[PDB]
Amino acid sequence: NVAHGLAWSYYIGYLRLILPGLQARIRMFNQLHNNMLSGAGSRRLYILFPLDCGVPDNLSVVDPNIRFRDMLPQQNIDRAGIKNRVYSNSVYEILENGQPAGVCILEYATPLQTLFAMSQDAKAGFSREDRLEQAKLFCRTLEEILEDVPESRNNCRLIVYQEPFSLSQEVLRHIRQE
Amino acid sequence: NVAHGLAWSYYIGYLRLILPGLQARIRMFNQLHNNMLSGAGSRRLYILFPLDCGVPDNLSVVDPNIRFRDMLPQQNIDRAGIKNRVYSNSVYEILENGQPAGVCILEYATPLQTLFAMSQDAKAGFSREDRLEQAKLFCRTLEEILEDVPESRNNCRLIVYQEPTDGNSFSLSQEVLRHIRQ
Ligand SMILES: Nc1ncnc2c1ncn2[C@@H]1O[C@@H]2COP(=O)(O)O[C@H]3[C@@H](O)[C@H](n4cnc5c(N)ncnc54)O[C@@H]3COP(=O)(O)O[C@H]2[C@H]1O
């Protein structure tokens, strides 16, 4: 199942690596940028999961209420022969009525671009309904791996959504949760 | 289709991205390192494909004759929200009883690590015969995807091999040299 591969790829090749040392890179960010990620809703990685598989590379474009602030300190790992493979995250202010109402670390789940792609292939196949079906399983499979590792919930939130819808707002919702 | 998602991932999420900008970075690497990557066989990205899916992080350990030299310039891309996501590649000397035999860009196919642990997982399951079958399919799917990308053959070389369990001899560093020597 493609989705299980995508989900295991995301965990193994990324989360499992990135998640143990997030709070470390955040204590550093606060010392460096004047205690910006102070709040509890600020000390997690918010991962956007459009079930439509539509994933823009620039967030400010898509919702002008999401403004780039800085990047977390870089994290450098030897990976499968690549020396110092770089793992980098970005920090964002979210706006409400043009005011900075909250800050967080934010990105999309990259492999949904891959799912989209497979789906448009003239021989691979899928349809919108098959692709949406695989997107949900991707998400479901990712959740259930994350359970066996309670370093997840402290460190990361999944934000899942389908568009049959305010992005900067739904992000504030979760930030304000904590 | 697990291997299929993985073959599409390595391309859509990597080779699509970095193969085009590869030669610009090499020529820069040459100007900062005394024209090291001189040969046509050196100006390629060599990707190791162990069908055994045992993919260690450090090469020199797995074959003493593969020595880390330096790194290519990094390429930064805004990607799915991450600003300046970094794409980095490493350069290697390949030794032959202490004599520098060839020099290239070299790495493993990272997703092989994913099949490995997937197989080991208690519930995700599948055996060593099933993982081997999926690793093969990965390569095959990858290679057919790449047909529509004529730049690729001038930029990267897939090096597929299974390691011996029968006692036979296999030299990885030799294998890389053969490919370079093409
Ligand atoms: N440094 C990072 N920063 C932020 N997110 C990250 C990340 N590394 C990984 N991810 C997430 O991990 C997914 C799979 O990572 P993976 O490393 O196993 O497997 C990767 C890897 O095999 C190859 N690859 C991708 N990016 C690479 C890179 N920057 N350097 C070397 N190889 C890379 O592409 C495969 C799939 O790439 P893909 O990007 O689509 O998808 C990545 C991405 O979704």
From Swiss-Prot, chain B:
Q: Which residues bind 3',3'-cGAMP?
A: Y14, R85
Q: Which residues point to the Cytoplasmic side?
A: 1-182
What happens on changing N89A? Strong decrease in cGAMP-binding
Residue(s) carrying Phosphoserine: S88
State how changing C139S affects the protein, per the record.
Does not affect palmitoylation
Substituting I77 to A/G/T results in: Strongly decreases affinity for the synthetic compound 5,6-dimethylxanthenone 4-acetic acid (DMXAA)
Q: Where is this region: Cyclic dinucleotide-binding domain (CBD)?
A: 1-182
Question: Which tissues is this chain's protein expressed in?
Answer: Present in spleen and thymus tissue. Also present in dendritic cells (at protein level).
Cysteine pairs bridged by disulfides in the record: none
Q: Which family, according to UniProt?
A: Belongs to the STING family.
Its function, per the record, reads: Facilitator of innate immune signaling that acts as a sensor of cytosolic DNA from bacteria and viruses and promotes the production of type I interferon (IFN-alpha and IFN-beta). Innate immune response is triggered in response to non-CpG double-stranded DNA from viruses and bacteria delivered to the cytoplasm. Acts by binding cyclic dinucleotides: recognizes and binds cyclic di-GMP (c-di-GMP), a second messenger produced by bacteria, cyclic UMP-AMP (2',3'-cUAMP), and cyclic GMP-AMP (cGAMP), a messenger produced by CGAS in response to DNA virus in the cytosol.
Subunit structure of this chain's protein: Homotetramer; in presence of cyclic nucleotide (c-di-GMP or cGAMP), forms tetramers and higher-order oligomers through side-by-side packing. Interacts (when phosphorylated) with IRF3; following activation and phosphorylation on the pLxIS motif by TBK1, recruits IRF3. Interacts with RIGI, MAVS and SSR2. Interacts with RNF5 and TRIM56. Interacts with TBK1; when homodimer, leading to subsequent production of IFN-beta.
What is this protein identified as? Answer: Stimulator of interferon genes protein
Task: Tell me what organism the protein belongs to.
Answer: Mus musculus
Q: Which gene encodes it?
A: Sting1
Q: Which residues of the full protein are shown?
A: 153 to 334 of 378
